[PDB]
């Protein structure tokens, strides 16, 4: 399976599902299908133990982690299920200064972003979601455009 895949039995169903312990992505299909740039999107949500616990939507940002990681949780399964889309809830919600452009990133290299963050973006593939990823900043959901 592809760099991070490792195959596992789900908890309610018994089933086999797919994990991907450098993205934190599950999935059930089999994953099937490295660049020198990959461009990304993320929504991240701070929390008080954050490098700058601060962003354009919170002067002072309060949440615990366990509360920031509640959050994510919560923006992954609408916008898994359909019910929202990731530029959307990054738009509304990210606490990050690039909410303003739906959370887009741009195009980066290998040794420019925080290690976590590079990583999961590395390793997705185009179109691809991540799920929880800890860095620093916060908390974040990546989607790899490019
Ligand atoms: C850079 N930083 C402070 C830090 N020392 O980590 C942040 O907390 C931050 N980190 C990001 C970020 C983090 C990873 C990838 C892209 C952007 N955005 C912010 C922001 O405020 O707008």
């Known amino acids: ?20 312990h450098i993205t ?21 949500v701070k929390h008080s133990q954050s490098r700058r ?9 309060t949440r615990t982690k366990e509360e920031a990681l509640e959050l994510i949780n919560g ?13 959307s809830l990054a738009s509304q919600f990210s606490d990050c200064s690039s909410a303003k452009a739906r959370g887009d990133l741009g195009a980066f290299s290998r040794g420019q972003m925080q290690k976590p963050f590079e990583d999961a973006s ?17 908390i974040h959901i990546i989607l790899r455009t490019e």
């Open 75 to 87: 923006y992954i399964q609408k916008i898994k299920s359909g019910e929202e889309d990731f530029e």
């Open 1 to 20: 399976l592809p760099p991070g895949w490792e195959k596992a039995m789900s908890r309610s169903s018994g089933r086999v599902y797919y994990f991907n």
């Open 122 to 138: 590395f390793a997705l593939r185009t179109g691809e979601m991540s799920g929880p990823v800890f860095t620093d900043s916060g």
């Open 53 to 61: 616990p601060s962003s354009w939507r919170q002067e002072k940002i």
């Open 24 to 44: 934190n992505a599950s999935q059930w299909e089999r994953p099937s299908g490295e660049p020198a740039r990959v461009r990304c999107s993320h929504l991240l």
